[PDB]
Amino acid sequence: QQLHVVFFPIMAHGHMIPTLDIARLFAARNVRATIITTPLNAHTFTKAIEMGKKNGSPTIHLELFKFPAQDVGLPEGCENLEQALGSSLIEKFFKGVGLLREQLEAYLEKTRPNCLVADMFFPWATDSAAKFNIPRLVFHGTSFFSLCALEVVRLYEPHKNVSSDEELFSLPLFPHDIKMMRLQLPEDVWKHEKAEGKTRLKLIKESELKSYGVIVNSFYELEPNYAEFFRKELGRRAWNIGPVSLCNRHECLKWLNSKKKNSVIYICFGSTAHQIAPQLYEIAMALEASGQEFIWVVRDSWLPRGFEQRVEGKGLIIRGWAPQVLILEHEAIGAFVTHCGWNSTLEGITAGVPMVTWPIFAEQFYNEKLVNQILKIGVPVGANKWSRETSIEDVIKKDAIEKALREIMVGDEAEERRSRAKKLKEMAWKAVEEGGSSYSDLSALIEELRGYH
Amino acid sequence: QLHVVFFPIMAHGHMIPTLDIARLFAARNVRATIITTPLNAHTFTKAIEMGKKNGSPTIHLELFKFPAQDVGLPEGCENLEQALGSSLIEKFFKGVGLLREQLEAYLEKTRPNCLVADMFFPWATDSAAKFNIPRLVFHGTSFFSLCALEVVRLYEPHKNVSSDEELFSLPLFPHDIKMMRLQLPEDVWKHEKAEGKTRLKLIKESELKSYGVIVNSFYELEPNYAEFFRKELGRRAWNIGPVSLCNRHECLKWLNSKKKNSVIYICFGSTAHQIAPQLYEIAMALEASGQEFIWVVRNDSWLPRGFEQRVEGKGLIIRGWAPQVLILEHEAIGAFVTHCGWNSTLEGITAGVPMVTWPIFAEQFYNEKLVNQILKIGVPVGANKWSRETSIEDVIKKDAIEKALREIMVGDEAEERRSRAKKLKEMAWKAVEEGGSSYSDLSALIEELRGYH
Numbered sequence: 075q076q077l078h079v080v081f082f083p084i085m086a087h088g089h090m091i092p093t094l095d096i097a098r099l100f101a102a103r104n105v106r107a108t109i110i111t112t113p114l115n116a117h118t119f120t121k122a123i124e125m126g127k128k129n130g131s132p133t134i135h136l137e138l139f140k141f142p143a144q145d146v147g148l149p150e151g152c153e154n155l156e157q158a159l160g161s162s163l164i165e166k167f168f169k170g171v172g173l174l175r176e177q178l179e180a181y182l183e184k185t186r187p188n189c190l191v192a193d194m195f196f197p198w199a200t201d202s203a204a205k206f207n208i209p210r211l212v213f214h215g216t217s218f219f220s221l222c223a224l225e226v227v228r229l230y231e232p233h234k235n236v237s238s239d240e241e242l243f244s245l246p247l248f249p250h251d252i253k254m255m256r257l258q259l260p261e262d263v264w265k266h267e268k269a270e271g272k273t274r275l276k277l278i279k280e281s282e283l284k285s286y287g288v289i290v291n292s293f294y295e296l297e298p299n300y301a302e303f304f305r306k307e308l309g310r311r312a313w314n315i316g317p318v319s320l321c322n323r324h325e326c327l328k329w330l331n332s333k334k335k336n337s338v339i340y341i342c343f344g345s346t347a348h349q350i351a352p353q354l355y356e357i358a359m360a361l362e363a364s365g366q367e368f369i370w371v372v373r374d375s376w377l378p379r380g381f382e383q384r385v386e387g388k389g390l391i392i393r394g395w396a397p398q399v400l401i402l403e404h405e406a407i408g409a410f411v412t413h414c415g416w417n418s419t420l421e422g423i424t425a426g427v428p429m430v431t432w433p434i435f436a437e438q439f440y441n442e443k444l445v446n447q448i449l450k451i452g453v454p455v456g457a458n459k460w461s462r463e464t465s466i467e468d469v470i471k472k473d474a475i476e477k478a479l480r481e482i483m484v485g486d487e488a489e490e491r492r493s494r495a496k497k498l499k500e501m502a503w504k505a506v507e508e509g510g511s512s513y514s515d516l517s518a519l520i521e522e523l524r525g526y527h
Numbered sequence: 528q529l530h531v532v533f534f535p536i537m538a539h540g541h542m543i544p545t546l547d548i549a550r551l552f553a554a555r556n557v558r559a560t561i562i563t564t565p566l567n568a569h570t571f572t573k574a575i576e577m578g579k580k581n582g583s584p585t586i587h588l589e590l591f592k593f594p595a596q597d598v599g600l601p602e603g604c605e606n607l608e609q610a611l612g613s614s615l616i617e618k619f620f621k622g623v624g625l626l627r628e629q630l631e632a633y634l635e636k637t638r639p640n641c642l643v644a645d646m647f648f649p650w651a652t653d654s655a656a657k658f659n660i661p662r663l664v665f666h667g668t669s670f671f672s673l674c675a676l677e678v679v680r681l682y683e684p685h686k687n688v689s690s691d692e693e694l695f696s697l698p699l700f701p702h703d704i705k706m707m708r709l710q711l712p713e714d715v716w717k718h719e720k721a722e723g724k725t726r727l728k729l730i731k732e733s734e735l736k737s738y739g740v741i742v743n744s745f746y747e748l749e750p751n752y753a754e755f756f757r758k759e760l761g762r763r764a765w766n767i768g769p770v771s772l773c774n775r776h777e778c779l780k781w782l783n784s785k786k787k788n789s790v791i792y793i794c795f796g797s798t799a800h801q802i803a804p805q806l807y808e809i810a811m812a813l814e815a816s817g818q819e820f821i822w823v824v825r826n827d828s829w830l831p832r833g834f835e836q837r838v839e840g841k842g843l844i845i846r847g848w849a850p851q852v853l854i855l856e857h858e859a860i861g862a863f864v865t866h867c868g869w870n871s872t873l874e875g876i877t878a879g880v881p882m883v884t885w886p887i888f889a890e891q892f893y894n895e896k897l898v899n900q901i902l903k904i905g906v907p908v909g910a911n912k913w914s915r916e917t918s919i920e921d922v923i924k925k926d927a928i929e930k931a932l933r934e935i936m937v938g939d940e941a942e943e944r945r946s947r948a949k950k951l952k953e954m955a956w957k958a959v960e961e962g963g964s965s966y967s968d969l970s971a972l973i974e975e976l977r978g979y980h
C-alpha cells in the first residue's frame with residue numbers, strides 16, 4: 075500500500091521552505107506528500123518543486139485553500155505572516171488562519187490521509203485530524219533546545235521572581251546553567267499580560283502533548299541532552315529528521331576564489347527583519363573599522379560618504395538574492411552574521427561556520443544560548459531586547475559590532491570555534507545519510523505511521 | 528441543565544466510585560447518566576433506589592450490549608471479576624474496546640457537555656472529540672499510584688537491577704521508596720508482552736491527551752503527589768474525594784461488649800478471590816494472635832475443626848454481607864486487614880483505622896508504599912508478589928500473618944499509627960464539606976465545564 079502524508083504549514087517563508095524539505099524527505103521514501111498552501115504563496119512551492127523535480131525527484135502535490143483576507147479585515151493580498159506589520163494586523167492574521175479549519179476538515183474527510191503534519195501555529199489541527207482518526211504531527215521549525223527552553227519558562231515562570239529588567243535568572247531543571255533577563259522575553263509574558271499571545275503560546279505547547287508527536291528539524295548528535303529532555307522530562311513523542319535542507323544532496327564566488335581561507339565575514343539577516351537606515355550605517359562603519367574582508371547582503375543615504383570606494387576589493391555589498399549555501403560552504407568564509415533564526419543557524423552548522431549572534435524576536439535568544447554557551451561556535455553582538463518593532467533606542471552601535479567582528483575572526487578562541495563548527499558539520503551530514511540518526515528516526519516514524527490502527 | 532455521561536469499566540471497584548462521583552455531580556444540579564451493561568445494572572439500581580426516596584436527585588442508566596460471544600467469553604461474563612485466569616482478561620479488554628461503536632452512537636444521539644470515561648478506555652478521548660465533547664479520565668486510585676506508575680514507566684528504575692528481590696528507589700519522588708521487580712506485573716519486568724505494555728502506555732498517554740483527570744483523593748492526604756501529578760507530569764486534575772463520603776446489626780451489639788481499639792476487622796471484599804489454603808492460614812493466624820476479630824468471608828474445608836467453638840468469645844465470622852462502614856467506624860475496631868485497593872484504603876482513612884496491607888495486583892503495591900512508608904498508618908503482611916492468578920505456592924503462611932496482626936495492635940508504633948489515622952480521618956471529612964479542598968475543586972471543575980467553548 076502507498077502511504078499519504080498531508081503537510082499544512084503557516085504562510086511564513088521560514089516555516090514553508092523547511093516544510094517543503096520535510097515533504098521531499100517523505101517523498102524520497104515512496105510516501106505520497108501533499109502540501110496545503112494559498113494562491114498568493116503557491117508560486118514559492120511551485121518554483122522549488124520544478125527546480126528540484128529533475129531525474130529521480132519523486133512528485134509533490136499542492137492543494138490550494140482560500141485565505142479569508144477580506145472576511146477578517148486584512149488588506150487584500152496579505153496572505154503571508156510577513157505582510158502582517160503592526161500590532162493591528164497580526165491579531166487579524168491569526169483569526170484569519172483559524173478560519174482555515176472548515177477547509178482542512180473538508181479536505182481530510184475527502185482524502186483520508188495516513189498522517190497530518192501541521193504547523194505549530196494550528197493547535198486546532200489535532201482535533202480536526204482526530205475527527206477522522208488521523209494522527210497529527212506538530213512541526214515548529216526550531217531547536218530541541220528552544221522547544222525545551224520556552225516550555226520550562228512558560229511552566230516555572232522564573233522571571234516573576236526577579237525585580238529589574240536586567241536581573242539574570244537560571245532556566246530550571248536544565249542540564250546546563252542558562253541565564254536570561256526579562257529584556258530577552260516578549261513584553262506580553264513579563265510586562266503587560268496580553269491574554270491573546272499568552273493563550274496562543276499555551277495552546278501551541280499543549281498541542282505537543284495532545285497530538286501524536288513532534289517532527290523536529292534537528293539531529294540527535296547536535297543537542298543530545300535536549301533531544302532527551304524534550305522526550306523524557308517534558309514527555310513528548312518526537313523524531314529528529316534534520317537538517318531537512320540537506321535532503322536534495324556567481325560573481326561573489328569568483329571574488330571569494332581570490333581570497334585566503336577563513337578570511338571573509340558573510341553578513342545576511344534574510345527577509346525575516348526590516349533593516350532600518352541607522353542600523354545599516356552602524357554595521358557599515360563597523361565593517362570598515364574592523365579591517366576584515368566581507369560579503370554583506372542588504373534586502374543610498376545610509377552608507378557613509380566614501381564607503382563603496384574605500385572598500386573596493388576588501389568588501390562586497392549585494393542587494394537582494396545571494397546564493398547563500400554556496401557562499402557559506404566556500405573555504406574563504408570564516409564567519410556568518412545572523413539573527414539566530416533556526417533555518418539560518420542550521421545553514422551555519424551545516425557549512426561549519428562560526429556565527430555572530432544578533433537575536434531579535436521569536437525563539438532567537440534561546441538559539442543564541444545554544445550557539446554561544448552549549449555548541450560554543452558563536453559570539454554575541456550584544457543585542458538583548460526582544461522586539462517585533464524596530465526602535466532607534468535598540469540600534470546596536472559600531473563599537474559593539476566591531477568588537478564582535480574582530481572576536482569572531484581573530485579572537486583567542488576563534489580557531490577553536492572554527493574546529494567545533496567543523497565537527498558539527500561532519501556530524502550533520504552523517505545524521506542524514508543512510509545509518510544516520512535522522513535517516514533512522516524518519517524510517518521509524520514512517521513504519522509507526524504504517525502500523526497505526 | 529449541564530449533562531455529564533459516566534462510562535466506567537465493568538469492575539465493582541470502578542463502578543461504585545463512579546456512581547458516587549455521579550451523585551456528587553447530581554447534588555450540584557448536573558444531569559448524570561452512567562453507562563453500564565444489562566448483567567451489571569442491578570449494582571447501580573440497588574445503590575440508586577436505596578439512596579433515593581430520600582429526595583436526592585435522579586441518576587439515569589444507559590445499557591450497552593457487551594459482545595461476550597464476539598470475543599469468546601461466556602455470555603454471562605460481563606464483569607472483570609468473572610475474567611479469572613490469564614486467558615479471559617485479554618478477551619475481556621478486546622470485549623470492552625468493541626464498546627466504541629455504541630459509545631460514538633450514544634454521544635451523537637444525546638450530545639452531553641462532558642464524558643467521564645474509565646482509564647481503561649483511552650480511545651474515549653477521540654470518540655468524545657468527534658462531537659467536540661471534553662473527556663475526563665477517572666482511575667479510582669491515589670495521586671501517589673498515578674505518579675508512581677508514570678515515573679516507573681518512563682525512567683525504568685528496574686532495568687538497572689539484576690535479581691527479582693533487588694531494591695530500587697522511585698525516581699524524582701520527595702520520599703525514598705524502595706520496590707523490587709516481584710512487586711511489578713510480570714509483563715513490564717520479565718517476558719515483555721506487547722498487549723499489557725501497550726495498554727498501560729495508552730492509559731498513561733490519555734491523562735495528557737484528554738481534557739483532564741478526576742482523582743478520588745483529597746489534596747491534604749498526599750499534597751506532594753497532588754502537586755507532582757499536575758506540575759512534574761503536567762496533568763490537569765481535580766481532587767474531589769473521598770467520593771465515598773457524599774451520602775453522609777448483630778456484629779455491632781457484639782462489638783459494643785469489647786474494649787476500644789481491641790478488634791481486627793478482616794474484609795477483602797466480594798471482589799476478592801480467596802483460595803482454601805490461604806483462608807486456612809488466616810484462620811490459624813487469627814487464633815494464634817489472641818486478638819479479638821470480625822472476619823468477613825465471601826458468599827467449609829478451610830476451617831480447622833472446632834475453630835468456631837474455640838474463638839466463641841474473641842472472634843466472629845460473617846459469611847457474605849457485613850455492614851462494613853458501621854463496623855469500621857465503631858470504637859472497638861483497632862485495625863483493618865485489606866488488599867490495598869484504593870476504595871478499601873479510603874474506607875480505612877475515613878474511619879481512621881490503621882491497616883494491615885495485603886497487596887495482590889493492579890496499583891496495590893504502590894498504595895501499600897503510600898500507607899506504610901508515607902502516611903505510616905499501616906503494617907505489611909509481607910505479600911510482595913504481583914499476580915492476577917492465585918497459586919498455592921504464593922500463599923502467605925500463619926507465621927507472617929500472625930506477626931502482622933500482633934504488629935498492628937501492640938507493635939512499637941501501634942498508638943502513633945492510630946493517631947496519624949485519626950488526623951487523616953478529620954482532614955478527609957473537612958476536605959469534602961463546604962469550603963474543603965475537594966468541595967472547591969468539584970465547584971471549579973463544574974464552572975470550567977459550563978464555560979467550555
Ligand SMILES: C1COCCOCCOCCOCCO1
Nearest residue numbers: 306307308309681758759760761
Ligand atoms: C512527563 C511529562 O510531563 C510534562 C511536564 O514536565 C515538567 C517538568 O518535568 C519534570 C520531570 O518529569 C518526568 C516525566 O514527565
Ligand SMILES: [Br-]
Nearest residue numbers: 297298299300
Ligand atoms: Br546538548
Ligand SMILES: [Br-]
Nearest residue numbers: 442443446454
Ligand atoms: Br549569549
Ligand SMILES: [Br-]
Nearest residue numbers: 749750751752
Ligand atoms: Br505527600
Ligand SMILES: [Br-]
Nearest residue numbers: 895896899907
Ligand atoms: Br511497605
Ligand code: NA
Nearest residue numbers: 307308759760
Ligand atoms: Na514531567
